[PDB]
Symmetry: C4
Subunit: 237 residues, 4 copies
């Protein structure tokens, strides 16, 4: 019970370290996990610098984004809650301002798969535009259930969603899957960006997207072990 819970906490901390070391996550970003013992709950670190998060910093939240914990929480915690209630299949949610992906949050050009490693994206990454329903005078943040409800809405049933002029949200069935996807989404965006200025891009076909987006099997763990080893090499625990 408490032993298993500690394991989930450790994985979130590890995922945070990996995302930071691999340049995916910034000072502002956070990853959560649905309590594997109780779907009505999820775990998320208190509002702190990512590089300082430990297992003792994880808070317990309900699907309403509220916690009994007396410590300060992330304002964008509602991004996680709203998605978990709308997507029962999702077990982990990650929010970042991933460098290479960021530009796609404010340009018309859609982020579409260009290599097999990006197939999990689907046709293209959906873009949530807060102006559509709230005008152009908002703070662009996701600090409310209603706004974050629209974000889940735009996400639909896909694997990723971009928040215009803000950042990126990655979802998946496990912390390891979300970390893997976040890493390759970043590499895919970098590749497409380079390609757009080298010549005409020939994208993956809907058929290849369907077929290739299914070979992301034993790959998830290999990636996790690799990035984990890289953490040991850097002495980042």
């Amino acid at each position: 019970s408490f032993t298993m819970r500690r394991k989930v906490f450790e994985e979130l901390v590890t995922a945070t370290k990996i995302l930071l070391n691999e340049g995916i996550m910034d000072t502002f970003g956070h990853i959560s996990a649905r309590d594997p013992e109780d779907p009505a709950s999820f775990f998320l670190a208190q509002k702190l610098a990512p590089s300082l998060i430990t297992v003792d910093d994880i808070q317990r939240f309900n699907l309403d984004g509220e916690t009994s914990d007396n410590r300060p929480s992330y304002l964008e915690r509602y991004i996680h809650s709203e998605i978990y209630k709308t997507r029962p299949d999702v077990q982990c949610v990650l929010h970042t301002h991933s460098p290479a992906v960021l530009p796609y949050c404010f340009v018309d050009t859609p982020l579409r798969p260009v290599t097999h490693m990006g197939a999990f994206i689907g046709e293209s990454v959906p873009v949530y535009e807060i102006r559509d329903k709230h005008g152009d005078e908002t703070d662009l943040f996701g600090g409310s259930p209603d706004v974050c409800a629209d974000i889940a809405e735009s996400l639909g049933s896909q694997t990723v969603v971009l928040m215009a002029r803000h950042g990126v949200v990655n979802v998946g069935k496990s912390v390891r899957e979300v970390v893997f996807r976040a890493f390759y989404l970043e590499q895919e965006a970098a590749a497409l960006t380079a390609g757009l200025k080298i010549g005409n891009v020939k994208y993956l076909s809907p058929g290849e997207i369907k077929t290739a987006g299914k070979l992301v099997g034993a790959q998830i763990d290999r990636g996790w072990n690799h990035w984990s080893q890289r953490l040991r090499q850097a002495g980042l625990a």
Copy 2:
């Protein structure tokens, strides 16, 4: 008195280390702080390699950019003084040749906010052009009160100002704020540059700039703690 003064010195040294480790500052760059005990004075390190600056290297300057210290000072110290006298609200001034931002110092394209993290910029970063009043035969440097007076002039009441074909100047109400802003100005410029070659950019609206540029609250310290932790991880003190 001397205890508090040492704290301000330590923060300047830390800020210097952070800016160097995060790739914002180069061999040429420097940050100052208005004496919190005396507005007519400000602190700035003697002319030395940034990586070698210690608390014992900080000099005391008046609003005329002069010091009793017998050690060599930065030639561009006038950039700091002239701004402090024109902007009483400013408590810290930073000058660098921040990589991603640098190109905006010599192209017509204005640096405008594209994500919420850049909202503090305002409509766009003003550009100081020395040729406007001094012709095209100058050294592009800011080594004189009159020239640096025009720089403060171009800065006006904004948060940043670019010196054409030279570098960037960041201002703020605290050392921590300037470090935070300098870091995100660099990330914002990088993002816009990438975006311009990916597709058509949809910028933040004046309304979002006003609203989002106000959520830069508890964020400042989280960033400082994160970059500070990153310094410990690298063994850079």
Copy 3:
């Protein structure tokens, strides 16, 4: 016999470490070597994270891509086997998703030599397109002798071949040669990409490609020693 075999194993491990440290190889990538004692066999690490590969992880495969080893193998092992049987001169094969090169896997613009260091490429890097013979509903992978047979086919007698929307394959007469070529192919692609957006590119002539592509002599070992030293500096063994 076993002493010499261990030396070949050690070189593969070293090459893997070098490619990872130099940013050529990713979590997904692998290098093999034809058994110098038996051409009908080649060596390749079992399916594991590259950063964890040791000499005890190398497997023995026949030219049919099969091993007596009971441990899991790479699915793309057929890429190596099919090339070794078609190219007797090749003693090492490397597969990666080399960052700078990757975009050329999905754009019309051909990767042509622009500096003497890229002369080994030949006129341009051939591109294998799985759609040509298998339609646009495949997984883009090279997990079968027939598909990988076409890859060898597209490679022909050249030094490199790109697998559309997938990755890159480097071949050579020695592990050291393939590592050298993989490193410079990455630098060459980076250079051309930068050049295409700076101005009009004046490529190497067929004559320079022939003459310059022959000075890659004692250079191979200097590079190997340099990257090997860089590994010691980083404490990566």
Copy 4:
């Protein structure tokens, strides 16, 4: 005598380490220094991996590019000799394939100063084209007095010269000056490249080039101390 000579050797080794750590120099690159005791001689490391060069690896060459040393020498040593005899004012010569600068070696767009830090370039960096006098079937190398004589010719009286489809050559009155210039030439090229794709570039005027290119005084040593400190921080001696 031998004490002073050792100091010159130490500086060359340090410069090599700095250029490697700052990403200016690659496996292939080398720096030399005119013997301050005898202008008819210059020092250059034997043909080895840059990361392995020590004071005991430096060779003595005459202005004909020949040495009594029995150890292998760099084939491009003639690049250094030919320049020293044509430019008595030059005391150090550096050859590299500096990343950001490299593209300018094969595109029509000239590398012109865009910030005060690049003023030392002059109007633009001259480009040596081997095809002009030797056709398009050469190895693009500088392995002969006659060819290298033309390189010195193209260099003229400037501070830098590009060898088409090959690399870059930096000259100066001291090892420290060449290291400083090589570092900023790289940053300047990076900046211009970024700028060209952001908008219309407003270059430094001939007047600013003349005036700003003279403030490169005490700056040289600050840079040297900074990069030297950075070497200690990395434990690279």
